[PDB]
XYZ file of N, CA and C in Angstrom:
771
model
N -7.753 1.534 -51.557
C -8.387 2.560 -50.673
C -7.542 3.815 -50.703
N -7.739 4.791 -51.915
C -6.426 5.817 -51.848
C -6.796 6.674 -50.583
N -5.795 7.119 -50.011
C -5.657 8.205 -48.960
C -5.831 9.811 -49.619
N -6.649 10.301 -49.422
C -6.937 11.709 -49.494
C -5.947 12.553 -48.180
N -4.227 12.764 -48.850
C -3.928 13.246 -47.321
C -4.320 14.703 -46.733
N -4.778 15.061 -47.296
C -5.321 16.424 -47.241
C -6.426 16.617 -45.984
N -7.352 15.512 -45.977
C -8.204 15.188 -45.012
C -7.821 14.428 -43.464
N -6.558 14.582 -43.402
C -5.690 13.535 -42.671
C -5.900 14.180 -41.040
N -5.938 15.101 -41.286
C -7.141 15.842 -39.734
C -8.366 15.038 -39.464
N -9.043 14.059 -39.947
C -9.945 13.260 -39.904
C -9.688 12.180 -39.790
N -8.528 11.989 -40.298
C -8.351 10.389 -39.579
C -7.183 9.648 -38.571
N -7.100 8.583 -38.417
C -6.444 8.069 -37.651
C -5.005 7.235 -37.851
N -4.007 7.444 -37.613
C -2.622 6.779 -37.651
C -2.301 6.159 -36.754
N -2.538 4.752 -36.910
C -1.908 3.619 -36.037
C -0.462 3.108 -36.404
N 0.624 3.236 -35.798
C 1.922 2.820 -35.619
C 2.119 1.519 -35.082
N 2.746 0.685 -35.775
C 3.242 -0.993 -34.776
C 5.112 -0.986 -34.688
N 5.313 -1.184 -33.518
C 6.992 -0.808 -33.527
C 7.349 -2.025 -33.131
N 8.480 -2.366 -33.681
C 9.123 -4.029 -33.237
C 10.281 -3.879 -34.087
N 11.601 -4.509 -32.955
C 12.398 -5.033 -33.882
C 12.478 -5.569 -35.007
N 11.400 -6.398 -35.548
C 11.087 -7.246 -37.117
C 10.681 -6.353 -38.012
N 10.342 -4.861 -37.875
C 9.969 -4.212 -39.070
C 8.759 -2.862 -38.288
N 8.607 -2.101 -38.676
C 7.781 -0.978 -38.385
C 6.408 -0.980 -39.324
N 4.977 -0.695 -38.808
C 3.897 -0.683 -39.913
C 3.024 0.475 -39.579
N 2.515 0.564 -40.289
C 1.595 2.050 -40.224
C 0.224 2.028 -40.868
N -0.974 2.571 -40.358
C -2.013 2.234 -41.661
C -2.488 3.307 -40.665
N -4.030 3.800 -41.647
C -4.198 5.118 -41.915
C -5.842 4.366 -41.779
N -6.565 4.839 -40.806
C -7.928 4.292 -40.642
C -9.128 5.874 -41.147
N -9.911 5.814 -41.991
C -10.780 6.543 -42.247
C -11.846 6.300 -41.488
N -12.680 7.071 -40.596
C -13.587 6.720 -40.064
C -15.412 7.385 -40.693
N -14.833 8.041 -41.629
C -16.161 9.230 -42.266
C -16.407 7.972 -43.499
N -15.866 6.774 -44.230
C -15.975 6.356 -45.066
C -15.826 4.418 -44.646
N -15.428 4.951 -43.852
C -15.435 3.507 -42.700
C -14.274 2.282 -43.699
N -12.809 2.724 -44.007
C -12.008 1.684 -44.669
C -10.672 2.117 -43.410
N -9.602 1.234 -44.329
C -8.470 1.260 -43.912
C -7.300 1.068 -44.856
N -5.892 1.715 -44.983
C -5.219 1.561 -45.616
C -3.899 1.118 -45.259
N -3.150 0.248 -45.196
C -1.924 -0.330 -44.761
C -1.160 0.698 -45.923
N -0.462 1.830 -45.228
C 0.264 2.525 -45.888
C 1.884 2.745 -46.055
N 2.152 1.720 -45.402
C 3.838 1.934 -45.331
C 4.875 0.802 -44.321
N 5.319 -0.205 -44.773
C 5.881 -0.893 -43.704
C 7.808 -0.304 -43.689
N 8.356 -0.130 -42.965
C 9.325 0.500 -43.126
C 10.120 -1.064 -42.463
N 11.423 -1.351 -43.244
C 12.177 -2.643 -42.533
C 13.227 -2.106 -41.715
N 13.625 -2.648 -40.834
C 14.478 -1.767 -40.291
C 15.643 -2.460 -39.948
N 16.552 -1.767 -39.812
C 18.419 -1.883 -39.829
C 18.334 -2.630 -38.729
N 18.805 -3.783 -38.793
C 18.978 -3.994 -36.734
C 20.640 -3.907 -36.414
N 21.057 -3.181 -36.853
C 22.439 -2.721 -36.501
C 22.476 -1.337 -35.942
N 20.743 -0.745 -36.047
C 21.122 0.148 -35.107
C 19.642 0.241 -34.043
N 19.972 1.044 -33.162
C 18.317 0.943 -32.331
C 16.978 1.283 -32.961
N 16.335 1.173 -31.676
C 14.949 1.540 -32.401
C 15.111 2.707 -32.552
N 15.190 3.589 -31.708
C 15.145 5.336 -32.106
C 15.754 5.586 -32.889
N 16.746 4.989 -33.448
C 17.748 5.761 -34.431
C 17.136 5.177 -36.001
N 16.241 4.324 -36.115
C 15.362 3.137 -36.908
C 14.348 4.482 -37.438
N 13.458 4.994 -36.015
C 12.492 5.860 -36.250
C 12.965 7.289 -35.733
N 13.858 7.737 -36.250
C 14.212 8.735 -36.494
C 14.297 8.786 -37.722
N 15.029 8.207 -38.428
C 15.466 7.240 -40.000
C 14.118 7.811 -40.757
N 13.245 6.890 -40.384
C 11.847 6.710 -40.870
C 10.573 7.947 -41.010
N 10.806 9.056 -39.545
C 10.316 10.010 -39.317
C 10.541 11.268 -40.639
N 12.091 11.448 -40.599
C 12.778 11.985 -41.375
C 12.992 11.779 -43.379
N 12.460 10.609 -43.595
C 12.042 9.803 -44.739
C 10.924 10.074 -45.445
N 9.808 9.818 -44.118
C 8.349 10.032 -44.718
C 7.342 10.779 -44.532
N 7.274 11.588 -45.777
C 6.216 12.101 -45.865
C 4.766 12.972 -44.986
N 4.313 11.480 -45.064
C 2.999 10.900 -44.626
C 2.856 11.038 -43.053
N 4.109 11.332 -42.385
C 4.318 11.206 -41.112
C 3.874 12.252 -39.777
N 4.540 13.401 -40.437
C 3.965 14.629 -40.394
C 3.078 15.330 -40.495
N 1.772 15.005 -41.718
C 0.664 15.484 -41.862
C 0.098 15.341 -40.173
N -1.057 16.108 -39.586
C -1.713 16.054 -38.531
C -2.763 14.979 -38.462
N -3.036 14.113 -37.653
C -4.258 12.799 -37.813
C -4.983 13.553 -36.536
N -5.995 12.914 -36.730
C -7.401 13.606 -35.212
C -6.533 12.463 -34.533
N -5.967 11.319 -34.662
C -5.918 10.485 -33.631
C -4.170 9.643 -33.920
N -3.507 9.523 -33.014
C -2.298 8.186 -33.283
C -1.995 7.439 -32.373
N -2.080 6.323 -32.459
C -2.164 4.700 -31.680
C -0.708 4.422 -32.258
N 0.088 4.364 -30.882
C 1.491 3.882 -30.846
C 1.297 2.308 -30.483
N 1.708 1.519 -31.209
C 1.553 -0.352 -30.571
C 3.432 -0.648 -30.431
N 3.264 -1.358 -29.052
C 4.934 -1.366 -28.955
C 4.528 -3.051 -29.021
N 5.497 -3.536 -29.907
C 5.572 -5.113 -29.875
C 7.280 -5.626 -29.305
N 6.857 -6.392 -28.425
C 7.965 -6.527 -27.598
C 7.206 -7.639 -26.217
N 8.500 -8.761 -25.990
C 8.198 -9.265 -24.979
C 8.020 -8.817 -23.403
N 8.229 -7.256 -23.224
C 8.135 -6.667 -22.086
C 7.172 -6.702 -22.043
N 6.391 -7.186 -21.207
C 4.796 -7.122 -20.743
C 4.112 -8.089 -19.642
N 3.270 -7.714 -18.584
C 3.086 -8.447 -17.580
C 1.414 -8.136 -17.238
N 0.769 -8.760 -17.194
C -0.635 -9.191 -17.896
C -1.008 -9.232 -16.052
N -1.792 -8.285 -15.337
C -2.685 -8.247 -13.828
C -4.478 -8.682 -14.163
N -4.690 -9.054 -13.223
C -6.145 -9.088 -13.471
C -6.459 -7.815 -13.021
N -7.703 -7.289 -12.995
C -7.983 -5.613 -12.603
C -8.118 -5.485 -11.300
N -8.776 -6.514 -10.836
C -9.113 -6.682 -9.178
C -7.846 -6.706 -8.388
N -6.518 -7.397 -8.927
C -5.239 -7.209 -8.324
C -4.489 -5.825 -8.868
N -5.177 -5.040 -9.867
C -4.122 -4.007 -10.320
C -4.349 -2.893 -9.369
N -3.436 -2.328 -8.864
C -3.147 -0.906 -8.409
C -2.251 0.008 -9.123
N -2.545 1.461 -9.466
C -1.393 2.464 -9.959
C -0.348 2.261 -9.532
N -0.345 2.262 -8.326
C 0.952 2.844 -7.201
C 1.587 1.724 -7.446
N 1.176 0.523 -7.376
C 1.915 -0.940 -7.782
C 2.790 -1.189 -9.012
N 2.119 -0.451 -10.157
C 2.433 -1.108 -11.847
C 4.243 -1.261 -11.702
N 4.886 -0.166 -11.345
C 6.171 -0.425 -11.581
C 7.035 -1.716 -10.980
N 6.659 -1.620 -9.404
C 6.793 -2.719 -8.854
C 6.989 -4.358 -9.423
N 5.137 -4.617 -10.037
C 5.228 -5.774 -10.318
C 5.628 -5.588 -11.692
N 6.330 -4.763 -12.425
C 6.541 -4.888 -13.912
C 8.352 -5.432 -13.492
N 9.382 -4.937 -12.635
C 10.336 -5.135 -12.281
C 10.345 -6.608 -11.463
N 9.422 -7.127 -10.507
C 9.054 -8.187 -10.247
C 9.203 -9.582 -11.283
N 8.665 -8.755 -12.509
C 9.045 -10.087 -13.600
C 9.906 -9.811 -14.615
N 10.750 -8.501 -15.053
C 11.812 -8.550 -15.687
C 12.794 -7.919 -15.309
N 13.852 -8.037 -15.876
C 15.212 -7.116 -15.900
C 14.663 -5.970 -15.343
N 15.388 -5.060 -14.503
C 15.776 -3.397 -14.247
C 16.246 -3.488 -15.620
N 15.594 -1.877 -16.244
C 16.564 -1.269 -16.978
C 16.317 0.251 -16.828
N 17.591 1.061 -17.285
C 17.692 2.406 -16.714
C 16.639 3.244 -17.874
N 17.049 2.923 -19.228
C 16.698 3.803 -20.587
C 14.939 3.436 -20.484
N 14.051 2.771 -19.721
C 13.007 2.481 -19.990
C 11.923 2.983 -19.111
N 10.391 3.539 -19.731
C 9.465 4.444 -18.587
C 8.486 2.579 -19.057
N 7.558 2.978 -17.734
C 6.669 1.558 -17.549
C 5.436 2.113 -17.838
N 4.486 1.624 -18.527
C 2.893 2.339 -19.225
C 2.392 1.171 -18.499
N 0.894 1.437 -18.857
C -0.031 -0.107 -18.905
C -1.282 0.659 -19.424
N -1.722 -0.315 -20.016
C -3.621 -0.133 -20.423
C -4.631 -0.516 -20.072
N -5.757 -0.528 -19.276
C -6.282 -1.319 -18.683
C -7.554 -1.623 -19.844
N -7.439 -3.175 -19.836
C -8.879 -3.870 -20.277
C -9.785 -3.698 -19.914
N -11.264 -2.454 -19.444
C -12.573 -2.779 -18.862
C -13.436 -4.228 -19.291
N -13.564 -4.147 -20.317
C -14.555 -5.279 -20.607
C -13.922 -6.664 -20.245
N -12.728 -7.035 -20.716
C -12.222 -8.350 -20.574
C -11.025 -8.159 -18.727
N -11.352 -7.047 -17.940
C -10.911 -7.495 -16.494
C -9.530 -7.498 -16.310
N -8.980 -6.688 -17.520
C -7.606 -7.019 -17.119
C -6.271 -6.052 -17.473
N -5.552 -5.949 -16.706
C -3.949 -4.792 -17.169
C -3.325 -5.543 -17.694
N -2.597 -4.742 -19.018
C -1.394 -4.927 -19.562
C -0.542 -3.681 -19.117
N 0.654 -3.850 -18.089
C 1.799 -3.195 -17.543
C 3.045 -3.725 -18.496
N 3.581 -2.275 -19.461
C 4.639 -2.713 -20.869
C 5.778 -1.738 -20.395
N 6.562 -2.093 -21.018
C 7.974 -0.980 -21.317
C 8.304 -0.673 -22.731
N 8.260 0.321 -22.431
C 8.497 1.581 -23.655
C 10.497 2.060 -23.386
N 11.109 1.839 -24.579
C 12.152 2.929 -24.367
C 12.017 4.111 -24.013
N 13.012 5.008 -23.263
C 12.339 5.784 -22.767
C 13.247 7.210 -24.427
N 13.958 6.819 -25.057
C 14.450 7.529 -25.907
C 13.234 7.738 -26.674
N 12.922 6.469 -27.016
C 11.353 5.994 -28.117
C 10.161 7.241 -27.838
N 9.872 6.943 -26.486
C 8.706 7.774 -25.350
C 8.931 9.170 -26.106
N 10.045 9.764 -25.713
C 10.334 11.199 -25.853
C 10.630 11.624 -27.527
N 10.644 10.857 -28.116
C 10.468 11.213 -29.794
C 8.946 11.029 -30.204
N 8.769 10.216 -29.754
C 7.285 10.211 -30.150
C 6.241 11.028 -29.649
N 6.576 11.114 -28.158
C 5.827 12.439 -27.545
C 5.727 14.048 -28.092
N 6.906 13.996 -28.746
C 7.748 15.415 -29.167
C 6.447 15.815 -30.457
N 6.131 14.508 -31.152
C 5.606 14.633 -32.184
C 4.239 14.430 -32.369
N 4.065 13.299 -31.684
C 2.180 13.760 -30.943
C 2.167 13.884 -29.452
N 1.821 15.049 -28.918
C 1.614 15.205 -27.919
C 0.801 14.370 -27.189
N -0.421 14.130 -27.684
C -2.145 13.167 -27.154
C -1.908 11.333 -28.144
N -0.715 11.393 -28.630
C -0.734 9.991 -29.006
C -1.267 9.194 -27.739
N -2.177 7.989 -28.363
C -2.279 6.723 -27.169
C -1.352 5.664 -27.294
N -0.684 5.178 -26.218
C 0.688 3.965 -26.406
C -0.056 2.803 -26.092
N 0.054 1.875 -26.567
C -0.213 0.646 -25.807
C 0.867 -0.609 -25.991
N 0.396 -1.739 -25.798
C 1.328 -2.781 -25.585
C 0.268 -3.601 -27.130
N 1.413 -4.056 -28.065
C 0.555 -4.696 -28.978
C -0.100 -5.938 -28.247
N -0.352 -6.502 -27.432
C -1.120 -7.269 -26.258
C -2.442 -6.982 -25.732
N -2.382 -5.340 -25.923
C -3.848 -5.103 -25.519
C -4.612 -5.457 -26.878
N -4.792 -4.507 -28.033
C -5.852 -5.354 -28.733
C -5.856 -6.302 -29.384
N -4.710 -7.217 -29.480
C -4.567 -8.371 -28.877
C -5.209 -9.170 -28.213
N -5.461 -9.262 -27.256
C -6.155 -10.047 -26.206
C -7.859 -9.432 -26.229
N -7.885 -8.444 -26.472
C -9.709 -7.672 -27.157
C -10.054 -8.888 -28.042
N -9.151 -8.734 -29.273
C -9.381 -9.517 -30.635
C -9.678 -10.497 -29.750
N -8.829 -11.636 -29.543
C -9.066 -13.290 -29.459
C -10.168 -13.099 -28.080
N -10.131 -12.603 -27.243
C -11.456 -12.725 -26.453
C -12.732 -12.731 -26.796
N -12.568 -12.069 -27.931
C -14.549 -12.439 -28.915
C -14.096 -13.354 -29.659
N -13.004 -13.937 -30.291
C -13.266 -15.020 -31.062
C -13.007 -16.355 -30.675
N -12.625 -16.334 -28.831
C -12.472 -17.370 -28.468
C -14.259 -18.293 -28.040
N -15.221 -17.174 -27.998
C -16.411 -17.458 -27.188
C -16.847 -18.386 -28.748
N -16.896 -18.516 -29.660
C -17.069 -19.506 -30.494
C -16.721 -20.935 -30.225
N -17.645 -21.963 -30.184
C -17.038 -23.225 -29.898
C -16.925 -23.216 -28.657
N -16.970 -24.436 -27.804
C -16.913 -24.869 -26.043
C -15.819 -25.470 -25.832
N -14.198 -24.997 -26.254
C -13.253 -25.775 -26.278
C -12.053 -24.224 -25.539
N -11.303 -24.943 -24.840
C -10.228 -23.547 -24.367
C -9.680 -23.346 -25.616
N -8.896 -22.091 -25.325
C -8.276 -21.719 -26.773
C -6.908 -20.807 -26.108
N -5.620 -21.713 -27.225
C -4.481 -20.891 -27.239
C -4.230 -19.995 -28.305
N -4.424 -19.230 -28.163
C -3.857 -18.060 -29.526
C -2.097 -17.527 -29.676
N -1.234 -17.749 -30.166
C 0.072 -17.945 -30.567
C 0.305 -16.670 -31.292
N 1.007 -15.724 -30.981
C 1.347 -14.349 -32.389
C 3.141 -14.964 -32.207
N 3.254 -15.284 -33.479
C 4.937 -15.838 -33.690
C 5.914 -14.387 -34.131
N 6.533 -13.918 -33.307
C 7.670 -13.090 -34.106
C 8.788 -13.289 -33.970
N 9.659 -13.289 -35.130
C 10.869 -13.587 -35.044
C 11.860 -13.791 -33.673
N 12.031 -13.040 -33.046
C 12.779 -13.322 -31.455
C 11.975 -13.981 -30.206
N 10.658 -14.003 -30.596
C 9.542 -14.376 -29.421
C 8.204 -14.492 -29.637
N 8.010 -15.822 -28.670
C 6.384 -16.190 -29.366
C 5.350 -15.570 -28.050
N 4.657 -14.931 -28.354
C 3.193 -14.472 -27.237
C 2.237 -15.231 -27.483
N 1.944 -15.155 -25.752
C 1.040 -16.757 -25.649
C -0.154 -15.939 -25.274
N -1.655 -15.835 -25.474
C -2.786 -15.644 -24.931
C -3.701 -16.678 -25.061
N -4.109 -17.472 -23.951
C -5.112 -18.375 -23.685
C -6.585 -17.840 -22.957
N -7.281 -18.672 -23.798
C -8.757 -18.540 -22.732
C -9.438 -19.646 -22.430
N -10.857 -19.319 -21.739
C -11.762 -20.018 -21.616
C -13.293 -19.592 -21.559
N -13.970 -19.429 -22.709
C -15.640 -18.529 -22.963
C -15.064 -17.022 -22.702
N -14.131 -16.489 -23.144
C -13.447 -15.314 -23.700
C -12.768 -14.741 -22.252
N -12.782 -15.265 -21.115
C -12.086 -15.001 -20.175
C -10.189 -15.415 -20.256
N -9.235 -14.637 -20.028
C -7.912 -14.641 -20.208
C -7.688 -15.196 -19.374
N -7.008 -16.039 -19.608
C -6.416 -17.262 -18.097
C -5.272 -17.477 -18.310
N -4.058 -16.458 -19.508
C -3.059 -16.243 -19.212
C -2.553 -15.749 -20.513
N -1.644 -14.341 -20.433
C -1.030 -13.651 -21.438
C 0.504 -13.760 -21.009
N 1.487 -13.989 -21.760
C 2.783 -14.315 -22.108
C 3.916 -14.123 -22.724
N 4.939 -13.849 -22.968
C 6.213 -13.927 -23.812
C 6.996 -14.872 -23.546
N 7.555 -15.247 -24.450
C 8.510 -16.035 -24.157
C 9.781 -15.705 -25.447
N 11.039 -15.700 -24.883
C 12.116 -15.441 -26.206
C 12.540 -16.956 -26.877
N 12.548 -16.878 -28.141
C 12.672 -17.731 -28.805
C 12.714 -17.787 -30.022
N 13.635 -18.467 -30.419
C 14.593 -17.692 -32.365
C 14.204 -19.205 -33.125
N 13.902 -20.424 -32.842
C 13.560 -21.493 -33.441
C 12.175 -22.476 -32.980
N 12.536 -23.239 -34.015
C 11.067 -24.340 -34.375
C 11.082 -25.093 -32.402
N 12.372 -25.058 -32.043
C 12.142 -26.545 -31.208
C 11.913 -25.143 -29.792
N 12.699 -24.364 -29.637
C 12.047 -23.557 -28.507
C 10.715 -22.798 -28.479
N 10.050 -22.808 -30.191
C 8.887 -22.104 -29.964
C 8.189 -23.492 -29.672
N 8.369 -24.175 -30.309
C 7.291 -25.723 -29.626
C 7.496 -26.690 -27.808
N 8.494 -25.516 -27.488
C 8.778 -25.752 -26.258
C 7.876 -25.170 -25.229
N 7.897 -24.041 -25.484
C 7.080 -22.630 -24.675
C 5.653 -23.350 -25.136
N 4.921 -23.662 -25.949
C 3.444 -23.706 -26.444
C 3.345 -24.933 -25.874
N 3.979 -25.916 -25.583
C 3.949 -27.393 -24.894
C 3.985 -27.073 -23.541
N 4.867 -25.978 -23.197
C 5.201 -25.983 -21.928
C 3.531 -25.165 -20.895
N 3.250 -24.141 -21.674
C 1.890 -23.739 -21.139
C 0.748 -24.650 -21.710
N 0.566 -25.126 -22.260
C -0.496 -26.303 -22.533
C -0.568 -26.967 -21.146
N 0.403 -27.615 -20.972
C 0.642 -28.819 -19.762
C 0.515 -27.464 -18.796
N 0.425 -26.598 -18.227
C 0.350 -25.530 -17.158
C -0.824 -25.471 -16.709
N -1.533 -25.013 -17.930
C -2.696 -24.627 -17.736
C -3.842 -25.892 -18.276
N -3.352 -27.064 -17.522
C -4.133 -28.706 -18.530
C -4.867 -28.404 -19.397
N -4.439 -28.030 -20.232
C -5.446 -27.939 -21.689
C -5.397 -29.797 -21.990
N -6.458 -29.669 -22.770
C -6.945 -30.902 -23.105
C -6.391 -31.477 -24.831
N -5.634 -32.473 -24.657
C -4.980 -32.304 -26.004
C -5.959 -32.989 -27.229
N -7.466 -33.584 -26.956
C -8.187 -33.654 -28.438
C -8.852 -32.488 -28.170
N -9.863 -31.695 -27.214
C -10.675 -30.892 -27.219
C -10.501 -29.299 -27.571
N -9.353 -28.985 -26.557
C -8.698 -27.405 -27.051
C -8.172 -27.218 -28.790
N -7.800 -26.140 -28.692
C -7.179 -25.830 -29.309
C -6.621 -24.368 -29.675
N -5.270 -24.654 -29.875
C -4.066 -23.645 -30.901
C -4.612 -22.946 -32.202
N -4.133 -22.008 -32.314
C -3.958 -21.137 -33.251
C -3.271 -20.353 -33.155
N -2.356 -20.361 -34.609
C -1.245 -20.152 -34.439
C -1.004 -18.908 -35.776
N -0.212 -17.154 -35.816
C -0.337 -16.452 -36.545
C 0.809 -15.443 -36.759
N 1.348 -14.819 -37.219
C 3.158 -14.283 -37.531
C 3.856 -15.001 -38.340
N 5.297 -15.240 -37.769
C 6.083 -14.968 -38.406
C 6.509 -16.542 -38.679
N 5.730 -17.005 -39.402
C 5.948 -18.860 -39.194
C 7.160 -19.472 -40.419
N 8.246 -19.187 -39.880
C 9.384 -19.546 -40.702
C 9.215 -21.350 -40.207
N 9.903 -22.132 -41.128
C 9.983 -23.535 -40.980
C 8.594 -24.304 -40.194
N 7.141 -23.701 -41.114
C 6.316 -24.250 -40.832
C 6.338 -25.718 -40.937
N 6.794 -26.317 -41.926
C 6.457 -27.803 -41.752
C 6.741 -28.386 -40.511
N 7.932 -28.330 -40.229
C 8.709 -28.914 -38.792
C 7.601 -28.129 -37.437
N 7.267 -27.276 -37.612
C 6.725 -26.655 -36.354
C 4.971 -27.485 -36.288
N 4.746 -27.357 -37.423
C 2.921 -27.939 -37.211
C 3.516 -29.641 -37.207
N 4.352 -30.235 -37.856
C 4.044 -31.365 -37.857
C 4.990 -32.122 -36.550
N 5.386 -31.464 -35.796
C 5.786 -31.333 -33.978
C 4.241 -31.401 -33.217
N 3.805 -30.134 -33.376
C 2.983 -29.865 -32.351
C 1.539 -30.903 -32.584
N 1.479 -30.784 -34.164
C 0.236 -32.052 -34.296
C 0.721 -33.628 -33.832
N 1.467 -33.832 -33.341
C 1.659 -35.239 -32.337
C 1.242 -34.738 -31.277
N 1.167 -33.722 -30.386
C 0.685 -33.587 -29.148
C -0.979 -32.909 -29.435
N -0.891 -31.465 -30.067
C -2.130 -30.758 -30.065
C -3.087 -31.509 -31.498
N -4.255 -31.852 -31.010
C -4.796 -32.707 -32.100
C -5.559 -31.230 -33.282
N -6.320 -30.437 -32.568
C -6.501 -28.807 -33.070
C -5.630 -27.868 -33.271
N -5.297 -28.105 -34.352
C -4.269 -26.705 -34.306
C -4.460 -26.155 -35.990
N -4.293 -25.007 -35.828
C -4.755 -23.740 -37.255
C -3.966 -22.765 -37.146
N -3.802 -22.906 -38.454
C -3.159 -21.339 -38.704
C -4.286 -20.499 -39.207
N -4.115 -18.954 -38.333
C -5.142 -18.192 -38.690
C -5.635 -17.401 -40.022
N -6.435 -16.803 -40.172
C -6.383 -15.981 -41.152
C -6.643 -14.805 -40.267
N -5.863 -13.847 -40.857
C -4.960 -13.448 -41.476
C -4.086 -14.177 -41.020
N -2.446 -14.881 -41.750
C -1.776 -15.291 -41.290
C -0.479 -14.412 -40.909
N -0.990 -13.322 -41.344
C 0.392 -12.202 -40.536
C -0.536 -10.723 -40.099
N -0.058 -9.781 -39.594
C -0.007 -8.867 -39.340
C -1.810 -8.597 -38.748
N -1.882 -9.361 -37.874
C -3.521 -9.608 -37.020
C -3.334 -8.457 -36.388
N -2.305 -7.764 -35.888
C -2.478 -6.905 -34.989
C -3.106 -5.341 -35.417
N -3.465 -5.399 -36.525
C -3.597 -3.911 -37.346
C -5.392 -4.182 -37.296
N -5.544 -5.551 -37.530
C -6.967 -5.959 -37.786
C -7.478 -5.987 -36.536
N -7.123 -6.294 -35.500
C -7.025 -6.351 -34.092
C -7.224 -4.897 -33.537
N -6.596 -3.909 -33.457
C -6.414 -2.786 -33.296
C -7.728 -2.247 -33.899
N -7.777 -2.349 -35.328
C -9.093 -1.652 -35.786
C -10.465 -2.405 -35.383
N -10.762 -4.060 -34.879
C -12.034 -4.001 -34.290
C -12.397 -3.532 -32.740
N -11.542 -2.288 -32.214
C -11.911 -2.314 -31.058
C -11.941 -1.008 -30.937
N -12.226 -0.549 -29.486
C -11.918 1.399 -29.386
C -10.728 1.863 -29.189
């Protein structure tokens, strides 16, 4: 799908930021494709801003003007309200309620209309102000929101609850449903096979999922798959790895608004 950057006033630049690596793709909407244009790996010896400063300064492609740019922050900061409990005046509150104070960080959230629900995230606040500098009208979100869009239409398939699993290297995110309703979004930190099969056991039994009827699906960063599926298939009798088996969140992002 070559990029015409010339036309780049027409289209759209979606950003995914995470400690595990930086991605970028370039959505045409006059020709209706998409192009995964650049994954940048990044140093973890130094921060994120100093990562995408690095990267800013590198490429190209970065600079041209897009009609549109979708910042996705991937990160276990995130605390999932239903809408009926969300208030503005509240978000900071209950975002500190469930993690660490920290000084360097501003608190966003996005609200879900159709699926009923806030995602309240943390953004660095160094991150915030470089990126702002450079799109003024960028939209931020929490890679959680289209996220939880995605698996909410593909959970209404089949009459069985459904856990959906995104594995990344430091932490696994948990989104469960039931007939595409969210009945619980999650992080949990976790660097191996036996703590990520800890956290996915541990909300199963939470939320009584049913261990022949439900089912897992599971998508990222699946280092030491054998040991991890052939764990969880003694307890979860359904369990899949998705397709795509990496980077859902770009595909995710592009089926929604």
């Amino acid at each position: 799908g070559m990029i015409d950057f010339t036309k780049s006033k027409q289209y759209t630049l979606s950003i995914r930021l995470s400690t595990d690596g930086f991605s970028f793709s370039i959505y045409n909407p006059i020709n209706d494709n998409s192009q995964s244009l650049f994954e940048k790996e990044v140093d973890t010896s130094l921060s994120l801003t100093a990562n995408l400063k690095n990267v800013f300064h590198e490429s190209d492609f970065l600079s041209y003007s897009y009609k549109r740019v979708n910042i996705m922050i991937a990160s276990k900061r995130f605390t999932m309200i239903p809408l009926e409990l969300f208030e503005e005046e509240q978000a900071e509150l209950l975002f500190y309620h469930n993690h660490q104070k920290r000084e360097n960080e501003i608190v966003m959230y996005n609200i879900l209309k159709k699926n009923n629900v806030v995602i309240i995230f943390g953004i660095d606040k160094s991150t915030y102000t470089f990126l702002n500098e450079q799109y003024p009208e960028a939209r931020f979100y929490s890679q959680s929101t289209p996220l939880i869009e995605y698996f909410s239409i593909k959970s209404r398939l089949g009459n069985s609850k459904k856990m959906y699993a995104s594995v990344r290297k430091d932490a696994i995110d948990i989104y469960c449903f039931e007939r595409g309703q969210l009945l619980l979004a999650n992080s949990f930190e976790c660097m191996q096979t036996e703590d990520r099969i800890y956290y996915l056991l541990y909300v199963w039994k939470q939320l009584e999922f049913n261990q022949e009827r439900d089912e897992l699906h599971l998508t990222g960063t699946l280092s030491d798959k054998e040991t991890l599926m052939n764990e969880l298939k003694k307890f979860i009798l359904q369990v899949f790895i998705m397709n795509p088996a990496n980077n859902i969140d770009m595909q995710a992002l592009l089926t929604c608004e």
